[PDB]
Design a binder for this molecule. Structure first.
Ligand SMILES: Nc1nc2c(ncn2[C@@H]2O[C@H](COP(=O)(O)CP(=O)(O)O)[C@@H](O)[C@H]2O)c(=O)[nH]1
Ligand SMILES: [K+]
Length: 307
């Protein structure tokens, strides 16, 4: 009764890319769905479920950077999108904003998922500044449309990738770092749903922290040794890639996983790190999992909303 069905939906080129790379990484008990106008992109997708939208509009090509085409394509394929989502308790929609299919279709996909009762999370990118103003303006319109259609939204400005690379870092490695935001969020929620805790949080706690909230932060931190709880908590909340930082969070789900050495003192330390960084009076849903396979490692999972 506890095993909520999670689906990750990539919409458009960048979304499809993220799905392919997450499948390559390995991720079980999550169903992947690839949605695109671009038939050739879908032919290369590794997702078990593929939905080609807008064939009568685009003749099987991509949207050619036109959000109107992405929106029309998704609206006309509503039933096929519904069929793929059916059964979902939680849907993550990922897309690169600024082109046509992601910008236009991802908000339609999210609205369909929300009206099917799924807890609906968007994780989307904004374009690099070097792509120019029209891409950014189109992306802004997509982001606003996404915000209206999801329960929670995580935006990754691609310009932040320029903050974490050196002059040689392969573009594909930078893209994998952006992928981690979505992948680790999904994994942390999957683990929370599946693993019974000593202070047990479940999918109903996820729904409470995320339903109808707007901006969100999802983070995981892992540390060991001295100060592990503080360091893990800091890692969970500190991503350089996020538009929405922890500052201003008024609601937090925090789950700590450790071995039998997990101390009460360090749990409070981790909670205090999150509360202080939010710089608000935070309402916390606190959970603890004891994994005796763990020795000195501690894992802190954070979901923050209420901005
Ligand atoms: N981090 C990241 N950003 C991407 C990727 N592909 C594309 N983008 C970005 O997503 C934007 C839209 O590209 P797209 O290929 O998704 C256009 P469409 O949705 O029409 O297919 C691009 O302008 C670019 O900013 C990607 O794999 N990783
Ligand atoms: K649980």
């Amino acid at each position: 009764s506890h095993m909520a069905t999670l689906k990750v939906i990539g919409v458009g080129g960048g979304g499809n890319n993220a799905v392919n790379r997450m499948i390559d990484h390995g991720m079980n008990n999550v169903e992947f769905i690839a949605i695109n106008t671009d038939g050739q992109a879908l032919n290369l997708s590794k997702a078990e479920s593929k939905i080609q939208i807008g064939e009568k509009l685009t003749r099987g090509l991509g949207a050619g950077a036109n959000p109107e085409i992405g929106k029309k394509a998704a609206e006309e394929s509503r039933e096929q999108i519904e069929d793929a989502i059916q059964g979902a308790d939680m849907v993550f929609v990922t897309s690169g904003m600024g082109g046509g299919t992601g910008t236009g279709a991802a908000p339609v996909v999210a609205k369909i998922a929300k009206e099917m009762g799924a807890l609906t999370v968007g994780v989307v990118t904004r374009p690099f500044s070097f792509e120019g103003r029209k891409r950014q303006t189109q992306a802004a319109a997509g982001v606003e449309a996404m915000k209206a259609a999801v329960d929670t939204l995580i935006v990754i400005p691609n310009d932040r990738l320029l903050d974490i690379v050196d002059k040689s870092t392969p573009m594909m490695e930078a893209f994998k770092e952006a992928d981690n935001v979505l992948r680790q969020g999904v994994q942390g929620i999957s683990d929370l749903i599946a693993v019974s805790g000593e202070v047990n949080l479940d999918f109903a706690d996820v729904k409470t922290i995320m339903s109808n909230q707007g901006s969100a932060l999802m983070g995981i931190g892992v540390s060991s040794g001295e100060n592990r709880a503080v360091e893990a908590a800091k890692k969970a909340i500190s991503s350089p890639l996020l538009e929405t930082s922890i500052v201003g969070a008024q609601g937090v789900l925090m789950n700590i996983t450790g071995g039998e050495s997990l101390s009460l003192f360090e749990a409070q330390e981790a909670a205090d790190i999150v509360q202080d960084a939010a710089d608000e009076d935070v309402n916390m849903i606190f959970g603890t999992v004891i994994n005796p396979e763990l020795q000195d490692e501690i894992v802190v999972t954070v979901i923050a909303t209420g901005f």
